[PDB]
Amino acid sequence: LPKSVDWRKKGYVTPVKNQKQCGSAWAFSATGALEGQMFRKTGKLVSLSEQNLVDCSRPQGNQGCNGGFMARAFQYVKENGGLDSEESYPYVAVDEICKYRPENSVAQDTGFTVVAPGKEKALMKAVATVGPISVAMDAGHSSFQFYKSGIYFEPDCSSKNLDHGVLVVGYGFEGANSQNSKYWLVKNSWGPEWGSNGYVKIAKDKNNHCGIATAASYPNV
Amino acid sequence: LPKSVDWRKKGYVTPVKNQKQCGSAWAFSATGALEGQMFRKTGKLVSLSEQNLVDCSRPQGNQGCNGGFMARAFQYVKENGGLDSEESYPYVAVDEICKYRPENSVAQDTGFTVVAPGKEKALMKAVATVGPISVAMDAGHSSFQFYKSGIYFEPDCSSKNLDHGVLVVGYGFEGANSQNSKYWLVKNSWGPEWGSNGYVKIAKDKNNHCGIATAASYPNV
């Protein structure tokens, strides 16, 4: 496997978005992974509608601004036959009535693939060979809210009790040794002003820190 | 016109590039605009060669790593009959021998269109109806060099004496009022690590701040 990967340099990743005051990170994580797989299939990078997921996937078990799951979102895209572009179905950060239109769909999936749970080397292999991967993490600590730079390591982090969906767009290492100070490159949905211009480096191969490899998945297109 | 525009979300913009220690930002602005118009024309996003412009457009009045103009670059692509891809004519950030190869050409233009000088509304109409637009700006300040987030505003900026070519990929606003806190979304060529993932928000409709609407243009494909 490569010593490092950054899918942003290859055209797979849309700009940093902002979920605002809505518990919809699961939808941002799902659109981020679907954006990368649709780009790998067609060569076109098109922002997808998180609002379409918030408003329309209650039947699949999501709860809009009250939380949800990236896999239920990929299940909704499969059962619905499509997902609208962000341009056609804009984000307003509140739960609203479904307004999906097939004429505005720009993405499809046939289901999803789960990465082996808890295995960071399985995750590293999926990040290197598939593209960005949806993951859940424990972001329930003030250190994550106030993160600015460097490798994030929170001693109180849980690898089992997760509360936030994010997108792994790569991995790498600080310093000149490829095996020391490793990290996962993560796209958050709290806007570009949070963290490292919207991104965070989470410590890698340090016992599944913050649960990054506990519930990872990607859509099949 | 739309309240906001962001061509990155529609597939028109390549990942942020880095001119390094060469005064070629005019060539990156020009390839960025041509990348968007070729994508509007064919549906395919193909990275274009700045080095081809640096090495070959001296007859049109550019001076390679010593500076140049986006309009002179669009004139070269017209007179030359084509422009090579980034992959086939790689960037090395120094003046080299012209190695233009017609068989590697992936773009063409018939000339270019100019936005009315100094008119921010004319620039807004061009960004909304055409795609990314080449523009010149006054970037000669340490506040720009160390810009990290938010709307950039510099009291010492000039709207007349400009020194750096960049690309307007959209515009928007902060908050709920679509007026107030308006900004231009600008792609730079100092690498993804500079600014906000390689981008800067420049204050919009504030008397043509930093000259963004003084010398704007786009290629005709």
Added chain:
Amino acid sequence: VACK
């Protein structure tokens, strides 16, 4: 009611 999982991730937010």
Added chain:
Amino acid sequence: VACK
């Protein structure tokens, strides 16, 4: 020239 100009833009750099």
